[PDB]
Amino acid sequence: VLGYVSDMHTELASISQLVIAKIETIDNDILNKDIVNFIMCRSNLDNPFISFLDTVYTIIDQENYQTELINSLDDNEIIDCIVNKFMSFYKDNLENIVDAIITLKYIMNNPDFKTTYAEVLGSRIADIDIKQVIRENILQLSNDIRERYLG
C-alpha cells in the first residue's frame, strides 16, 4: 500500500533484524507507550518493534473477521479475553505476547470496548518489561510467522 519495497518474506526478515539491532536504544517506558499507542491505532512506525507488529497485523489480515467476532461477544467474554491475553506479558513466550497485543488492538477497534477498557489497558501495559523476551525470540518468531502465513 504505502512503504513495502518487496515481498513479506523480505519485510519480516529485514524488520526483525532491525528490532534486534535497535531494541537496546529504546527506553522501556518509551517502548511500552509505543505498544499502547499501536493498540489504540496511533502507531509510531519509527519504532522497529511497532513496525514489526504492524507488518504482522497486515500479514494476518483478519481485521474484518475479528471485528465481527468481537461484536458478538458480551462484556464477560471480553473481560475473560483481556485477562487471559494480559498474562502473556508476564511470561517468556513472544508469540503469545504478539498475539496479545494484536488481540488487544482488535478489541480497541470496537468503540464500546475502547471506551470501557482503554484506560486500564494503558495503565497496566506501563508496568510490563518485555525487552528480553523480544531479544531472545524475535528472529525465530519472524521465521514461524513466515512459515504459518506466507507462501
Residue numbers in the entry: 13 to 163
Task: Please quote the paper that reports this structure.
Strikingly, despite a lack of sequence conservation with known family members, A49 adopts the Bcl-2 family protein fold comprising five α-helices wrapped around a central helix, α5 (45). The A49 structure shows that A49 lacks a surface groove compatible with binding BH3 peptides and is unable to bind the proapoptotic proteins Bax or Bak.
It crystallized readily in two distinct conditions, and diffraction data were recorded to 1.8–1.9 Å resolution (A49 Δ12 ammonium sulfate and A49 Δ12 sodium malonate). Residues 13–17 adopt three distinct conformations in the 10 A49 Δ12 molecules observed in the two crystal forms (inset) and are disordered in one of the two molecules of A49 Δ12 per asymmetric unit in crystals grown in the sodium malonate condition. In four of the eight molecules of A49 Δ12 grown in the ammonium sulfate condition and both molecules of A49 Δ12 grown in the sodium malonate condition, a single residue (Gly) of the C-terminal purification tag is observed; in the structure of full-length A49, the final two residues (161 and 162) and the purification tag were not ordered and could not be modeled. Visual inspection of the structures of A49 Δ12 and full-length A49 showed that, in all cases, two molecules of A49 self-associate via an interaction of helices α4 and α6 (the “4-6 face”). In the structure of full-length A49 this interaction is formed by crystallographic 2-fold symmetry, whereas in the structures of A49 Δ12 the interaction is formed by pseudo-2-fold non-crystallographic symmetry. In the structures of A49 Δ12 salt bridges Arg136–Asp92 and Lys103–Asp139 are formed, although these bonds are not symmetric and thus formed only once per pair of A49 molecules. Additionally, we observed that A49 crystallized much more readily upon removal of residues 1–12.
